[PDB]
Amino acid sequence: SRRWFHPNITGVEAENLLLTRGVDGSFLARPSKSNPGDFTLSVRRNGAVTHIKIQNTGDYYDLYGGEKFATLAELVQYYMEHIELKYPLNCADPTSERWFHLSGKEAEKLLTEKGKHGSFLVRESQSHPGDFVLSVRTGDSKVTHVMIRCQELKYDVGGGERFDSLTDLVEHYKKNPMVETLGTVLQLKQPLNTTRINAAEIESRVRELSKGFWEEFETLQQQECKLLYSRKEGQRQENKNKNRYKNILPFDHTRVVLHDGDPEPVSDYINANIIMPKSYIATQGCLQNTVNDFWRMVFQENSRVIVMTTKEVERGKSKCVKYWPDEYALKEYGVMRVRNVKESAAHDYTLRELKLSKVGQGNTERTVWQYHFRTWPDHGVPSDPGGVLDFLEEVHHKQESIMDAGPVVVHCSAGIGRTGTFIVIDILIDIIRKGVDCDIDVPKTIQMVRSQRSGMVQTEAQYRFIYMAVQHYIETL
Template sequence: MVEKSGIVVHLKQPFNATRINAANIENRVRELNKVADNSEKPKQGFWEEFEVLQQQECKLLYPRKEGQKPENKSKNRYKNILPFDTTRVIIRETDSDGPGSDYINANYIRNTREDERHAEESKVFIATQGCLQNTVVDFWKMVHQENAHVIVMTTKEMERGRNKCVRYWPDLHTSKEFGKVMVRNVEEHPAQDYILRKLEVTRLDRKEPLRFIWHYQYLSWPDHGVPVEPGGVLWFLEEVNRTQSTMKDTGPIVVHCSAGIGRTGTIIVIDILIDIIRRQGLDCDIDVPKTIQMVRQQRSGMVQTEAQYKFIYMAVQQFIDTAQKRLEEEQRSKMKEREYSNIKYPQMTNSRSKHNMASSRSSSVMTNDDSSSVYENINFKTPQTSFSSNTRRSDVVWHLSERDCHKKTGKKEGEITAHQMAVCLRLKNRFVSKK
């Protein structure tokens, strides 16, 4: 950038750069939400950023030949939404050698922008379309082949009178065969925004250990648009990730909606960004458009609308806000702990420290008015064992005189602690008042 004076100013980050520090996402969202003052350019912010992304999408000309083949056309829910050949899931186990037997409309999605240090930690997704009647068997072949244990479904079976996904699981407590795979619906747990199903999967053609699939169906995504607020989606993703993390040597998370690009893309991008923040901390850099561009290089059309694009920002912002509040609360708790741990007490001799420790114990006991414990703390035996039942209260008071305090504790005059003397006087007053 060059100023009017001719001085060249080198910017660390261009004005129109989309990379931001995660902790500053609130400022970025505020900027994108601003209404343009320039009447010649009424649409700015999210709309403009998303439009630039859409123009870049047109430049992605990866081959999609497999999906265009005549034998595979019936396996595509939408004729214009086809998987890239470079990242498509290939079904290795086929029933025949016929053409198209290895095809399914699905792509692997990875965080390819992750550096080598975190590459192994990154999750792998499979983004796919909602099942058709003639693709359910292929779907279960894919799930079994990829050793997937978690399926995320972000649509209902029917929306606005149209089928969005054929049911590919049996009713509760029933079983159903899908080719060589037997699926049993063991459990269903309805939650506020989703249903969690536990599916038991076995092979019919060979002996294998039982495999359990966790099926998360999110129900609160409206037919058109996005959820009103991202809290439900964030909680849903947290549950999905918790389950995935408990699985040993598990495969990719299978994510689908109807077309496998809109809600599916939105969910995957949010999860990728949150993973980056979790691993690198709130001071890391994130880039929403670049992340979307990255997943679009693996499956075309991911994140379909401006509303979905904005929702990603809202979800990441809420995640960061929650993380910051949690961090601040933890820091406050640590500060309080340090305040107490930093208190230093004066050095004491061994004899004095023993008595002072005893006094500190007695002070807490005194709140319960437990006189026997008080006596023990100043080296007195309890009245029940020191005196007979016929002893008068006035005699007890005499034994609790200052002189007796010195005698019983073995201390010389001036050495007895103020607290021990206070105990004597307190007990003396109590007995005198009851005479």
Template sequence: MCVLSVHSWYHGYLSGPDAEKLLQEKGEPWTFLVRESRSKPGDFVISVLTADTKDGKPRVTHVKIICEGERYTLGDVKYDTLTDLIEAYKKKHIEEVSGARVYLKKPYYSTRVNAADIENRMKELDKKSEKEVAAKAGFWEEFDALQKQESNLLYERKEGQRSENKSKNRYKNILPFDHTRVVLQCRDPNVPGSDYINANYVSNLLWGAEEPLKHFIACQGCLGSTVGDFWEMIWQENSRIIVMTTKEIEKGRTKCVPYWPDADTDGKEFGHFWVELVSEHEAMEYKVRTLRVSLLENRNETRDIIHYQYLNWPDHGVPSDPGGVLSFLGEVNRMQESIPGAGPIIVHCSAGIGRTGTIIVIDMLVDIIQTKGLDCDIDVQKSIQMVRSQRSGMVQTEAQYRFIYSAIAHYIDSAKHKLQAFEKTKAAESEYGNLAPAMTKMKVSRSPSK
């Protein structure tokens, strides 16, 4: 039986048509990938994008790799591993039956990984090479591919570009997609743009329709002129949790105007709302505030909003410890689950795409692993593509991309240790389980009679 040497150009059980689609979208001649043969299980196939065209599209050719015993061959030289074979043909050409030459110049890297194997994947991505091209075949290449694909998301952003809405955007180039934007329902028909806020609904679209979905709203940090709209959105959506991943001021620049009152006041008016600070306490890396909100016209109807402000996340950077972020998210989710009927979790930083996107993607991936188990497949790059289809630019830097991997690896490692501890406890209970009924009887027999 052939033992597969797993490599990032290996795409597993991928069909021929799907391989062609991936390579044609890439569009760079001599890009290749390796997949399992569907016609003959046990063999493999190299799919290569050639420099030729067929029916107006770049032609993809498929070269079968035969597995003989423990060795691999294209029909001539035999190699000990699949990696050896691929590395050999990267240095020379493959000749097709027609006589045409095929070259393996650039691997199309698979970003899907088994969750339990994510540490090995990170080590592979971290590997450095003396060759400049190979050195880019890691985190940099995966993130660079994401950046190139961003231009393909040609969704309209007309509302944010309207003259009456331009001043409501913290950054003129970071605008919400129209198809997922939050529309403020209590608009004034006489005021153009009164339904606008720089915010988008974000959900995990990679899950099947039968799966439970957790919903988020990703938005920019408040401007002085948009605080009333912000509270309008929270009230409209019945959101009870706000996650703020920025400080109000960083490096001398305002990142978000405070939308809650000072502790020494009874409360503060924001637009149509009255907001009180009920409590505030500081945890290891974040602050938790309870804010009580009511409509100015009806102060009797109140809602408590839990406001989490993560303090140890530098702008365009990442926290030093992913464990802190995971603990923070655990607390946020426990609180969200404890509030029946709570609306989407509001997440924002300053622009509402970098730190905001990073924390949402981490939470989504953890949800998948918790639901499907440590042996499920996850895809960091595809997850980011998915959230970027709902709000542009989510996850801004390579450092943030790498941090998502680190956070998931930390979560997996912690889960493995918990599982081992649970199994030891279970084994101990099983070993002494026959004593439990006897001990119970002893306790009962010693109870004072009534």
């Protein structure tokens, strides 16, 4: 449902809402206004409201007194199946729906300039403030307007059932479409796309979102509820301690499956996923016990470029074990043998030239290049995207320069926040690098990658950093 999230309520607004429209076991989650980036889980117990903080600095949602998760949905899912969270107290604000917005004539052109059969949107009435309008497109070539009146806190389209919110109303006429007198069926097949822009417009769009970014991002967040794909392998007993974060797991359907492993019972698991929009494996920072597994992956998938986006230690916290030999040194990691051939240090990153081979057979050698980005801020995102961009641009040419190279391995700590910011920037400039004659749809791209790994861009700050990055790249054409 994900409608248990309320984008714009204060604490007290939530408390009274739980205590007036809810029962013991009712809960909700809301953006925290004390700390931008944080969120708050609000639950009713014994007729009282306890509030639970959840911090997300860019790596994961850290529920205090609980566990760390990829999305708030997987969080709620996790706790609704094991202070009890029984009944979602659902939100009626539509600000975070894909279809909500806006003048009629302006609505008609967009539907004409960008819509197909079934594209629709809901806007606020201009004739009677308080009422709403549902504008829908039908064709093979017509746009239809359906007024939605607000009466005594309930909404309708002039007859039939009265709804407690537009989302309910809309959801009802998606499954039960209005039929006009001459046969025309007003099918609400897809919300109108207003986020895909031409690459040359990014600068215009970024300026108007800065007076916007919040709304669009959380409108993308609200859609994570569609991405609760199974992650069972990662919960299997033999795999629990192969995860750096027990509750941040790879989708079974996109995980990398290690083959040709030791006869041990389970030898095919690693907290990684293939990311296909050049392809990527998105993974977590190695642990002591999965280093040999990490290199089995690199070998198997023919990866020749690794991109690590964290220090080994950050703020005294460990984030990734040292899985590469010292410069000029040679190490054996299970059946895999790695020599660090040379290291080169730039200001923002280090390149390690690593040769990977399988012990015993000197016909499996391949160079692997590890690009170790070292200047990401301990919290937040870089104030400027130049460093990231030149990094990725270097990374891309290295990858393009090797024949038959496999996925490009990308990893941070939990492998969702930073790792996902990078891959996405990389996909988008991949497009712009086609030139400036191309459309860019950041939300779409983020959602396509979250469908392949949980939580793949973590924060709003990062989300805007992606826009800044693409803008900057376009400026430098």
